[PDB]
Each structure stands twice: as structure tokens, then as C-alpha cells.
Design a protein around this ligand. Sequence first.
Ligand SMILES: Nc1ncnc2c1ncn2[C@H]1C[C@H](O)[C@@H](COP(=O)(O)OP(=O)(O)OP(=O)(O)O)O1
Ligand SMILES: Nc1ncnc2c1ncn2[C@H]1C[C@H](O)[C@@H](COP(=O)(O)OP(=O)(O)OP(=O)(O)O)O1
Ligand SMILES: Nc1ccn([C@@H]2O[C@H](COP(=O)(O)OP(=O)(O)O)[C@@H](O)[C@H]2O)c(=O)n1
Ligand SMILES: [Mg+2]
Ligand SMILES: [Mg+2]
Lengths: 734, 129, 49, 69
Amino acid sequence: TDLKVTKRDGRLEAIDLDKIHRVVTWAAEGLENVSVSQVELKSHIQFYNGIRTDDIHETIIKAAADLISEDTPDYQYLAARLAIFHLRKIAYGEYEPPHLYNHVKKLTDAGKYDRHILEDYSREEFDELNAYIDHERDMSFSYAAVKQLEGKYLVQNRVTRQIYETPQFLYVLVAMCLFSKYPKEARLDYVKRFYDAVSTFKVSLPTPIMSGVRTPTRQFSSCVLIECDDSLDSINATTSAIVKYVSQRAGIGINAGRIRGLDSEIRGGEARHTGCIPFFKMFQAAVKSCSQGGVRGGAATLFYPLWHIEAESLLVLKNNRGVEDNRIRQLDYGVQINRLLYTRLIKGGNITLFSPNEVSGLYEAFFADQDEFERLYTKYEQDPNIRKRIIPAADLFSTLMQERAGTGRIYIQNVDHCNTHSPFDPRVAPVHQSNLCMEIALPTKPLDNINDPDGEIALCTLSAFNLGALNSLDELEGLADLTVRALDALLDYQGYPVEAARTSTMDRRSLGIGVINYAYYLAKNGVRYSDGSALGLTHRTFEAIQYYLLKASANLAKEYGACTLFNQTVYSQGKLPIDTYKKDLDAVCGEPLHYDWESLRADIVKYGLRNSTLTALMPSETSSQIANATNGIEPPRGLVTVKASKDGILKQVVPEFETLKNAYETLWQLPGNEGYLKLVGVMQKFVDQAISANTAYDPGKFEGNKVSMKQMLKDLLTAYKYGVKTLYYHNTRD
Amino acid sequence: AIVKYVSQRAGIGINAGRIRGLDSEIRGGEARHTGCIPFFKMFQAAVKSCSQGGVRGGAATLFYPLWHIEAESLLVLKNNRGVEDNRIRQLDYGVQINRLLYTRLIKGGNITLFSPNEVSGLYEAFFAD
Amino acid sequence: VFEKLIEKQLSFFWRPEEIDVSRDRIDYANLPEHEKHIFISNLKYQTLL
Amino acid sequence: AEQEKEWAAYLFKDGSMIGLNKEILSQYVEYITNLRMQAVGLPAGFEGANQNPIPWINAWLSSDNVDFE
Ligand SMILES: Nc1ncnc2c1ncn2[C@H]1C[C@H](O)[C@@H](COP(=O)(O)OP(=O)(O)OP(=O)(O)O)O1
Ligand SMILES: Nc1ncnc2c1ncn2[C@H]1C[C@H](O)[C@@H](COP(=O)(O)OP(=O)(O)OP(=O)(O)O)O1
Ligand SMILES: Nc1ccn([C@@H]2O[C@H](COP(=O)(O)OP(=O)(O)O)[C@@H](O)[C@H]2O)c(=O)n1
Ligand SMILES: [Mg+2]
Ligand SMILES: [Mg+2]
């Protein structure tokens, strides 16, 4: 009959008999062991009259990546080629993008971009810089990259999905936008370095910076902190703040460990109306709101101290089986711990919880000292006429650990190690909470109302440089010598909704960056995780970037003024973070101090006043797939990673699978978490901000396939010995 | 305002019939994040707070027009038998009615609900002329 | 390794009428002309060889 | 081999078809030739000898062939 389809334009095309193998041959033009006949046949597509060729490409690529495995894990590049082809088609239709101008100058009025780029550069040098971005490098992605890219990484209407960009103009567009306020004498020759860095996957960038660049809504932070004390106005203010701020790509570290107990009301009335149970519903509903910029749904994380008179009787709120009185399972609860509570449990002391507001000089003392703190803690155990609740530490700890193993989302922060290693000065402004991902810390001051400048909240900004995509670490300085400079222009460029949030972030200029890939570099080195050959193997080069990044910061900010709050920092005293670590033995992974650059700290005290924070270690879960790297510092679940999300079922592969088929190790094959603990502790020798660690077990290696209670407790304790950072998912295995 | 005022012997007549439909977002993003269903949870949790001066527990009452594009499909939120997606039974819901809607029913006209913000000069006109 | 085994391996014997092949005529009409042409060509080549 | 290759044109010089039209079948017959001839003793007449240009055919063809611290 009339075997016609709806072509790219809409006219009735031919029967698609021939010219269909042309595209798949174009894809597999230089691959191997790819079954063109199978993928052309295993599509299992319906051939009814009235189909659109765009839908045909969609379904053939949905069926292409479906049939993949370690047997023939080769044509994932074919899927990526088909993906970028369909993307360039839905962008223009042809296979020849404009010369960076007909696309930019023609789409600038579309409102998707910011109406200042064209007014910030010249048309003459525009074409000169245009002949540097041949799109031939765009054919080097993976399906796991283009998938998330088309999902939510670049500019597009979230209701129409009509993409208006291209993954090639992305890098140069962001690099050109980040370098606006600069002298017009070297920016043209300076943007090329950053473009070559980002295109070769040597430096990685998050969604908050790639999902929000060159966009009218100038918001680029990644996490924010806020704490609320005992006051109604403060609660209203922080509720308005969380409602307003989460609407632009935010991360929340809410803390409310200072509200009230359940004792009484002085001027006549109920104590707290059942305490924190109804109050936390407000925050839970607040964080459950509009998407964080239009990409995903945010999720905050609350905290409260263990000595609260409202004990872990409220901690069950994350459990599943229970009445609907208090079971709000929408947050990431947090609890504080110090060096003495575990000691009181080891000795067997029954901890006696009490009311925060009913006593004076206790909450701040929980972070300040030990003599007065212990004296007060015993003096109340002595003071009869104040209402408390005593309980053996064993039952409380067992309930907490059971809730953690059940829900798998309860985090714990080590406040003792949260000050003894921070670059800040723990004498005038200590830390009090952590963001939802548990990798950062900064001082925070409460507020009575949003319009007042008395309060102050802080934020940060992330980035990542690859570890494994390089050949020699020597050039890293130059790489750093660019990115931080670029990151500088990021701070004084973005906007701030909360009027009080501007001052603190303009003063401290806190900034931390990390790394994406960890397993590929370790395999290229030639050591595994189980035996312990990596316990000091990473101290040869990785122990140098943390000390040489400060060199780049000093060389790039020795003339850019000073930090308005630099005096409030331990590093401002004259001691570099080269030995200020409270290790267990300081020789568990003993190695000679490779780079003791005292000239660095000399010049720093001389005139070096850079950003407050230096670096961090974020997991970068949504990111790190653009370059097809390993998700965070944790090893992959297997050789091929089968992942699931709202889109579908993806299958990513680790790099160098052909030449290193059996060179990595699956986390299913590493039962001893002591190796992971030793690794993160070796990283503790040079970590700046924090690390987002994680542990995982396997019920197939226990007595009766049931979880233990002291073995994992022993693991927690030996993690509390050396390498003491935040906690995360229990990460069981069904 | 509702968090601060209800704490002293108050009675609330909250009205939120002018928030958004579920159409779209101009500058790029979702329309309303499922509309009023998640937004009303905030008010429900707010009114569920400390006693109104220390005698009893207050309870507000929301309102919304019938011509809202989000139709009475949300009115079931006060029903008992149903999933926990949207069944917040803690308020006194309210709906607006004029002299013409009942007439349109008597004549048999199938009422066509629409979005408040997508059109101009309609919400105030619902009370003016 | 000969007829002592391979001729003894010919135990897959099967009657051709013992199977059911009826869906052919129901799935032969609605097909392109060239498809039927090449199908009959292949069948003729097989039977002649 | 060349005679069979030339034969595999008449039953194809009328229209395309899913799976294989001319190149896939040519690669297949070349691979079959190169794999079968290297079982009686003869120099390889065709270079490459890469993977099977159509592997799913192997799925049907006679799988059962014959602390205080
Ligand atoms: N013969 C065909 N008839 C209908 N659709 C086809 C055919 N071949 C392929 N398709 C699918 C895959 C193509 O990406 C899509 C149409 O893209 P398109 O580039 O316009 O096809 P085309 O290459 O034959 O036209 P043109 O040569 O003008 O570029 O439809
Ligand atoms: N209406 C209320 N009745 C009883 N407690 C309330 C009420 N509203 C809030 N609360 C909780 C949260 C408040 O932080 C705390 C009361 O402290 P506050 O807000 O300073 O008011 P207040 O000064 O009248 O009481 P207090 O003298 O105990 O601080 O009790
Ligand atoms: N749904 C999420 C997940 C993480 N985050 C934040 O992003 C960081 C970790 O996520 P990520 O680095 O994998 O995000 P991407 O850069 O990969 O897009 C943490 O600081 C989180 O607070 C978020 O805002 N929303
Ligand atoms: Mg074409
Ligand atoms: Mg008070």
C-alpha cells in the first residue's frame, strides 16, 4: 500500500526499506564485534503506517542499549553515536552547526540565555575564537552520558523538551560566560585552556554549575546551612528561608536541636505541644515543595543532640512499621556525638538526657570545653529539682543502630573531629551542623527575621578534577592555576535571595572541590583494596595535590586583595595543614612528607589571603557520568553497572574494560570494610573539608544470614579510632 | 503569619484560591509541582501547632473557586477511604459559589474549569460584575 | 569415529507429516512481492541442490 | 566461492529487506568460506576472518550438535 512515514519535516516518505542500514553503518564505522544485523533486527519495532522517524530512532536506541553485557560491551559507543546524532537532528536537523554566532546571536533573544554575553564580547574576535571547536570530538561520549545529558543537564523547556543547545557549545559557552569581567587582552587566549581542560574530561563540573550557567536565574551554590534556636520568630524566619531558597538548586543542612523540651511554659500554657513531633512536620512539608530549579526534588537533613530530653523515642520517626502519629519518612535525620558518650557507654554509664532550654550553659558547652561541661553534667546528676530521663546506654545505642540498619538513611556527625581539623578557629565560631550530603561544615548564626542583617547563613561551591585521565601530575598546577581563578569569578557574579546570606558568603568566599574517578587510577597504578597495598600507595601523588592547590591559590590571589574574614581561620595563624591531624598512631600508613613547602605558608602569612575553604570530597553521583568515570570514591558494584531511575534501565561500563577485564574488584568481593576505612583515613592525611564515606555489608557472610550487632559496631568503633568523618547509607545487599 | 498568630487565641480564614494551576512555567521549570496538593500540606502543618493560648487546638479553613483548573479532583482530600497521596483531613475546606453556576447546572451547561493565572481579569471579575 | 557412531547418531528420525505447519498460508498473503520471490528462489535452490 | 557470491545477487537485485541485503550476506559467506576451508588443509583465501557478521544464527543451528582502648 502507501508505506509512508512522518519524516523529519512531516511529508510522506518512502518505505524505509533501504537507507536504514546507512545510519548504523555510520555508527559502527570503526568499532568491532558489533552485531549490526542483531541490533537492526532485535529492535522488535512495529511497522504500522503512521510512524515518525524520530520515534523510530527513539525506539531503536531504546532497544540498542538494552542488549548489552560483559560478553559484548562494545557498541555502547554505537548507542552514544546514535544518541548524539538524534540530538543534533532535534537541534537543527542537519549535521553542521553554525559558526558559534548564528546560534548564539539568533537564540540570545529566546530568553534561555542571559542578555549580557553578546554585550560583553566583540563580534570580530568571536569568529576568531570560533575556529577552535571542531565538533569531531563530540563523538567520544557513552550512552550513560548522553542519557542523563538529554534528561536534565542542558537548557531545554521542561514541559516541551524541545532542546535548544548542543553538548559541544556547552563547554565554550560556560567558559566564555565565566570570564566576562576581565581585561580584554588575554581572555581570548585564556579561555582556550579551560575549554581544552573541560573537553578532554580532565576537569569535571556539577549540575548546579552546568545546569544553571548562562541562565537568567543566577544561582550557583550547592549546599546551605541554617540553625534555629528557641523562638517563634526564628522558626517563622527559617521556614520562610527554606521555602524560598530550595526553589533554586539548593542543598539544606537544617538544624533544630535547640527548640524546647516538654517541661512547661513560664507565662502560662503548654510546654511545647508534644515537642518536636508537630514542629518537624512544618519543615518536612517545606522541603517537600517545587523542584530545586526544575531538575529533581530536594531533601533536607535535620539534626538534634542525643542528650535531648525528647530521647530517641522520636528517632523511630524514620521506621516503617508503626502508627501514623509520628512517622515522617521524608528527611535524613542526624544525631550529634562527642568523645565522651561512647566512653560513657564503654564504662556502662546510663546516660541521662535533659532539657536544653531548662539549663544554661550546656548546648554551647557541648561544643566548647570539657571541664565545665563535665562539671555541669555531673552537678545535674546531683541537682534533684530539675526533670530528666535516665536510661542505660546499651538500649539507646541498640535502638539507634537498629533504626539505622532498617531505614538505611540515618547519618551521624562527629563534632569532636569536626573542629580539631577544620581550618576555622574553634574558639569564636564553631560548627553546628552539616549539609544533606554530609561533606561540609561552616559556622552559622540564627536569625529573628529574614529582613534583618543580624543573622548569617553560609554556602559553598563545588568542582572536580579527574584522577586517571591524566599522564603526569606535574601539569596539574597549571590546571588548578586556571580553575580556581575561574571559580573566583563565580562568586562575585551570582545573586543571593536571602538578604543575610550575601554578607557571609562575600566575606568568607568558602570553596571546596574534589575528584570523580578513583578505581581507574588505582587499577592503572597496580594495587587492590583488599590486601592493603593502597594504604600508602596513594600518598605518592594524591598527597601532593592538597598541598599544591594552596600554591595555585596563593599565586592567583596574591594581588586580589584579602578575605574579609580571613582572620577567623586557624590557617591564618601560620601553620599549614601538613601535620595538624589527630591520627591514631600517625604511622599506620607511614611515608616521608613529600612536599613540605614552607615557602607557601611564608608567602601566605606575607600576603596570601585566599578563599576560606580549600577543597572537599563530594560523591558527584549525578555527575561523573559525562566522562564515564567511577561514581565517587566507592568502587563499582560490578564490572558493568546496571542502574535504574525514572527514565529507564541504563547499563554503564567502567573504562578500559578491554585491556583490564579482570583488574578491579567488586564491592561484593571485599568483605572487610577495614580496608575502606584505612583508605579514607589515608585520605584524611590531606583532606580539607570532609569526605562523604559509605559502608556496605553482605548477609551472605554471617552466621544465619542475619545482621550482627557487635561486628558492625566494631567497624564503627575502628572508624571512630582513625579516619573519623561523617556516616551514610548502611547499604545492605538483598 | 499563620505560625505566629495562631499561638494567641486566634481564628483563621485562610484563602489560597490564587496560587497556580498545572499549566507550565515561563522561565523554564515545572508548572506548580502537582499544584495545590503539596502546598496545602504546609498550611495544614502550620495550623497544627501549639495550642491557641493554652486552652484548645485551633483549626483553619481554606477556600478555592470552583472554576479552578484543579477541579474537585482535589476535593476528595477530606474523604476517608483512599491512598495517602492527598487525604489531609485536618482543615475545613471551602468552595465559592455565585448566582450563575447553579443556573448553568439547572440549564445543564457543562462547566469548564480553567487556570486562574493563565487568564487575566477573571478572579477579580468573579466578584465584580 | 565413523558410521559406527555417526550413522548410529542418526536417531533424530522424524516423520515430516508429524509436525503442524498451517500458519504458512495465513502468513504468506500479506507480504511484499520481492519477499515471496526470494523465498521461492531459495526454496527452489535448496530442492535442486 | 566467487560463483556463490555472484549468485547472491540475483535474489537481491529487486529490493531491500530487513536483516541483510548485500553486504551482510557477503561478509557472512566470506566468513563461512574462511572458517570452513581451514578444516581440511589449505591457505586462507580471505583475510580478516573477523567475528561472525551475524551471530544470532548460532542460537538455532544445532546447539546439541554431533574494649577499653
Ligand atoms: N527510508 C526511510 N524512510 C523513512 N524513514 C527513514 C528511512 N531511513 C531512515 N529513516 C529514519 C532514520 C532517519 O534518521 C529518519 C529521517 O532522517 P533523514 O536524514 O531525513 O533521512 P534521509 O537521510 O533519508 O533524508 P536526507 O537524505 O534528506 O537527509 O527516519
Ligand atoms: N503558643 C505557644 N505556647 C507554648 N509554647 C509555644 C508556643 N508557640 C511556640 N512555643 C514553643 C516554641 C518557642 O520557642 C517556645 C516559647 O519561647 P518564645 O518563642 O520565646 O515565647 P515566650 O517568650 O513567650 O516563651 P518563653 O519565655 O519560654 O521563651 O515554646
Ligand atoms: N537530590 C540531590 C542530591 C544531591 N544534592 C547535593 O549535591 C551534592 C551531591 O550530589 P552530586 O554532587 O552527585 O550532584 P551532581 O554534581 O552529580 O549533579 C551534595 O552537596 C548534595 O547536597 C542535591 O542538592 N540534591
Ligand atoms: Mg539524512
Ligand atoms: Mg521567650
